[PDB]
Amino acid sequence: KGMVYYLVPTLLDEFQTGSVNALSMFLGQVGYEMKTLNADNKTDAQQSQMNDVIALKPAAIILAAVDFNALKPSIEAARAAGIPVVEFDRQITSTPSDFTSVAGTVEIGHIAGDHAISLLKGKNGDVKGKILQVPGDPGDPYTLDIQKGFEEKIKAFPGVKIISVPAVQWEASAAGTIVSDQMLANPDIDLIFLHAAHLSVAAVASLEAAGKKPGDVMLMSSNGAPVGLDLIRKGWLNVEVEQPLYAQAAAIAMFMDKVVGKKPIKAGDYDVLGLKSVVTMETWGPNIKIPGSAITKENVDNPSFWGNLKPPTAAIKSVE
Numbered sequence: 555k556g557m558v559y560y561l562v563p564t565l566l567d568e569f570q571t572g573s574v575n576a577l578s579m580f581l582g583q584v585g586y587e588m589k590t591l592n593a594d595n596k597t598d599a600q601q602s603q604m605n606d607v608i609a610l611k612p613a614a615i616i617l618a619a620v621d622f623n624a625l626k627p628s629i630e631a632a633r634a635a636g637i638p639v640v641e642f643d644r645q646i647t648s649t650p651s652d653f654t655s656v657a658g659t660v661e662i663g664h665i666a667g668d669h670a671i672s673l674l675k676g677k678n679g680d681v682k683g684k685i686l687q688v689p690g691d692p693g694d695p696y697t698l699d700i701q702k703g704f705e706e707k708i709k710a711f712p713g714v715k716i717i718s719v720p721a722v723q724w725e726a727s728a729a730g731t732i733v734s735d736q737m738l739a740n741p742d743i744d745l746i747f748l749h750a751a752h753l754s755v756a757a758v759a760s761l762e763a764a765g766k767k768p769g770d771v772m773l774m775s776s777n778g779a780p781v782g783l784d785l786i787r788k789g790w791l792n793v794e795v796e797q798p799l800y801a802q803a804a805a806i807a808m809f810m811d812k813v814v815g816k817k818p819i820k821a822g823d824y825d826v827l828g829l830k831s832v833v834t835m836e837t838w839g840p841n842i843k844i845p846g847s848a849i850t851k852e853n854v855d856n857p858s859f860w861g862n863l864k865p866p867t868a869a870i871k872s873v874e
């Protein structure tokens with residue numbers, strides 16, 4: 555049917571390596587081969603790779619941009635040369651793509667927010683306290699939009715103080731250092747919210763080295779990686795708001811025939827791996843937005859949560 559290239563930004567967590575495996579398999583089910591190129595968090599490498607792939611004229615490119623600004627010209631070059639470009643996970647609103655498959659990021663933030671509020675209230679009686687937020691890389695719209703959705707909720711209660719410190723390049727060691735430094739300066743911190751679970755792995759270790767045990771400082775993160783689900787069962791993590799990795803990948807495969815053949819993608823409500831998903835036509839082109847979900851000890855074992863690594867059995871079917 556055609557070759558698809560995936561320009562993955564890094565392979566430095568379970569969502570990234572997982573996305574490779576999920577895209578390859580689902581694209582295999584609808585008849586496409588896939589090849590993966592890793593930018594390892596270097597914009598230069600990814601732009602070199604775009605051009606390399608442009609020159610290889612595949613049936614489509616799937617991009618998850620290291621930096622959402624820097625790649626805008628690249629995306630345009632591909633489309634100039636009539637190569638379909640699909641944006642995965644990291645939304646690029648500034649220039650048209652042929653398809654976009656993302657989580658509801660602002661909504662994940664909102665969900666994070668609601669729980670931060672119910673937590674704190676649970677601890678402090680009133681909606682008050684202090685939160686440390688550890689967003690991801692500033693070049694990444696996934697964490698940028700989660701930040702908006704989260705702050706929107708918290709700001710509504712000025713009795714909650716927020717301290718936010720980004721983990722540059724999505725690095726857990728940066729998270730680690732932030733948590734130790736912010737904790738020493740603020741022993742009153744009630745909750746840390748980090749925008750992906752591999753960051754919470756560092757937070758836990760930092761909290762441990764300060765003498766803390768599970769539950770002492772509440773913790774939440776927002777991508778659903780396996781390590782997060784581990785930390786939930788261990789009592790370290792109060793909440794993990796997942797993004798639906800498998801659905802986001804499957805959605806790309808479901809629509810690949812429309813994307814490769816340059817056929818239109820119809821707006822509406824779709825089911826993707828059992829998730830109600832919403833396709834709209836945006837200025838950056840067709841866009842499917844798949845909901846995230848709050849996970850706690852109470853539902854951490856649900857097989858629909860990608861962190862349990864139970865991908866749906868059967869197969870994807872191409873949208874007609």
Ligand SMILES: N[C@@H]1[C@@H](O)[C@@H](O)[C@@H](CO)O[C@@H]1O
Pocket residue numbers: 567569570643690694696697724750777797
């Ligand atoms: N949505 C993903 C998130 O799960 C995480 O893999 C991050 C890489 O650390 O990149 C993107 O933000």
